[PDB]
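User: what does the whole thing look like in 3D?
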Amino acid sequence: ASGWGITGNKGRCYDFWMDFSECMSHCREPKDCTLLREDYLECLHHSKEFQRRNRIYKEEQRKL
Amino acid sequence: RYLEEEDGPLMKTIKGSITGFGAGTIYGTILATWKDVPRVERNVALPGLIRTLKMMGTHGLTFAAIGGVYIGVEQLVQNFRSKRDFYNGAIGGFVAGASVLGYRARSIPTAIAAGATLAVTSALI
Amino acid sequence: VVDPKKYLEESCKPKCVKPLLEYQACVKRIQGDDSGHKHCTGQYFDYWQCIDKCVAPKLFAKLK
Amino acid sequence: MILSVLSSLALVSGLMVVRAKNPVHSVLFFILVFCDTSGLLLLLGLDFFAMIFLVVYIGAIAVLFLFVVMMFHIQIAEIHEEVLRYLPVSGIIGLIFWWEMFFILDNESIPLLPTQRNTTSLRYTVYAGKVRSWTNLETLGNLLYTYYFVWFLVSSLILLVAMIGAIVLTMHRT
Amino acid sequence: VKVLTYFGMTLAAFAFWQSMDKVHVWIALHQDEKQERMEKEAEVRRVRAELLRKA
Amino acid sequence: MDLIKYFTFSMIIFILGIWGILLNRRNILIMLMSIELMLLAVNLNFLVFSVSLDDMMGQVFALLVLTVAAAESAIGLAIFVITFRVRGTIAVEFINSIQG
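Assistant: Here's the predicted 3D structure for the full assembly of 582 residues, as structure tokens:
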């Protein structure tokens, strides 16, 4: 969220954080910014990407 | 507000006894750890551990007794009468407290005080 | 007027939401014929066993 | 695997810190935990922090502990106790903490299972950020003294308090 | 402790960490079941609320 | 699985600090050292998280925490020294006068 990257460039997830912040800056219902918020968290932790790839791995293991 | 359960009076009593035994084990562990060791048991490890395990067993047994007799008498009072109130469970708490805590404390006034306290704590529930 | 049994069965549904959904789940999976072999007796029994248990202690209070 | 080795060394060294009969030995095993931590930091790519853990934790703090604990000449009788009676309470607390706390990232950070496929060709490489590389030292120094300098100065105030307290509590001038 | 006692402890801890790796892999493998169970329970709660909100 | 393993390393260090508190009723020096272990585990978490999130805020706090750890160790050992000097021993039976 700070934008300072550990190698001297813009942080990896900073643009997602900003877009989330601009959204929340004028949407009175926080549910209006859900998609951008989960995009920022997905950039942080890669949870859904890894879950889907683990699904692919599971199906491959099942069919082997 | 309560519609999440499958019930079963026998299962209720069994699970209450199990939960009470777990709570008594943990409480006895804490009590044993809090107290110091007697002077003639400081250079020897085994007796302290034996005493701790004995405290765990004793308090687990006592708390399981409370947690079983409470729920069992509550259900047996609410079944044989077929009415649901805080009056049932108050009698169960009274009998559980009185019986078990007077057996352990070896006194009638202590049993009455425990029963009264347990009945109040169930009436506020 | 209106049967107290039928009304009480309807008002006991929120206490048996879990079996009702499971019975509905079975109905969808058996909509294919498969030679007239599949059925949902077990899910039907579980749902009504919950409803009947909910209705029994309150039915006789409305009857004289 | 290397993380397993460092984790095992740190586990045993820390057990030795908390279970050594002689406190001097406890301080020396603490130095081993700090060396292991420095190795972990080197694996993270943070060389400045890996070296600073040696300079400060081992070079300064652990030396302070060693100097004090050596001149105390503590006899084993004043600090000894049989710890067998603490197996159950430590078992309960450690198991609760273990289950709740070693898996706190699992739901948020689901691990990527290693497939039997070369997923290392899917590494995209951007040469724009590699033209002029910043060290971890320069990246930290870009921020400490300008954009977050107030925290820097407050840390200096903390150190000044340490100096004053050390003098007022222990000084006996000759 | 003796040097060999320390090394045996380190080997035991290495085995413990490999077991921890197995545990993490197992927990990862059961994400889909857990999300499916969560969805079914959420649907149960939502159906119950919508049926209770009706009255 | 990298992040979880780094985190469990920090976790075992924190847990060892908690255990050192639990197991050393009669050894307050090791109680202090266990607290230092807990502080190292938190410092590592900040560094690991800073690497994981590609964000420098974790490292700034890691340096400042190292400063805090140094100051706290200095003052703690001073208080240890004066307590020892007053009593002539470090045994916990001589630091229990205040009670009730």
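In plain terms: Chain B touches chain C through two residues (CB under 8 Å). Chain B has four helices and no strands.
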